[PDB]
Amino acid sequence: HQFSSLRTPTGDISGQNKNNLISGKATGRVGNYITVAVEYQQLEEAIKLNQLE
Amino acid sequence: AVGYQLLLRMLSDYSLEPTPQVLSNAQRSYDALMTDTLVVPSMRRRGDFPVGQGNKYDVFTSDRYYPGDLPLIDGDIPNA
Incomplete structure (x- = not known):
């Protein structure tokens, strides 16, 4: 919050034009999926690749 | 192959019996x-x-x- 002031030379001015209270927001959300997919013959892959690592 | 098989199936139309060499070639x-x-x-x-x-x-x-x-198993269609 931020405020602004007034410049007057009198003190018994208890009734005047005051400030205002405005509340803001900053909204965060989720994005799209990060997906990588492979299709392949698992037997041919496992011919020479242990544990698919 | 197809020609020899067809010839063997067609000789009976003209009632001509085959010969051993023709039979061997077809085989x-x-x-x-x-x-x-x-x-x-x-x-x-x-x-x-x-x-x-x-x-x-x-x-x-x-x-x-x-x-x-x-x-x-799909999970739906559980019985076969």
């Missing part, structure tokens, strides 16, 4: 045709046959037992 052609198309299926493992510890079985390598004829 050789049919044998070559059959040779060019051979399947000789290789039998697969039973399904309850265990897989030894040498084939390291894990979630991402192989299951404890050899895969078989059983179709994978």
Whole structure:
């Protein structure tokens, strides 16, 4: 919050034009999926690749 | 091959009997045709046959037992 002031030379001015209270927001959300997919013959892959690592 | 088979099926129309040389040629052609198309299926493992510890079985390598004829279950259509 931020405020602004007034410049007057009198003190018994208890009734005047005051400030205002405005509340803001900053909204965060989720994005799209990060997906990588492979299709392949698992037997041919496992011919020479242990544990698919 | 097809020509000799058709000739053997058609001689009876004119009532002419074949000859040993024609029969041998037809046999050789049919044998070559059959040779060019051979399947000789290789039998697969039973399904309850265990897989030894040498084939390291894990979630991402192989299951404890050899895969078989059983179709994978969809989850809907539970009964066949």
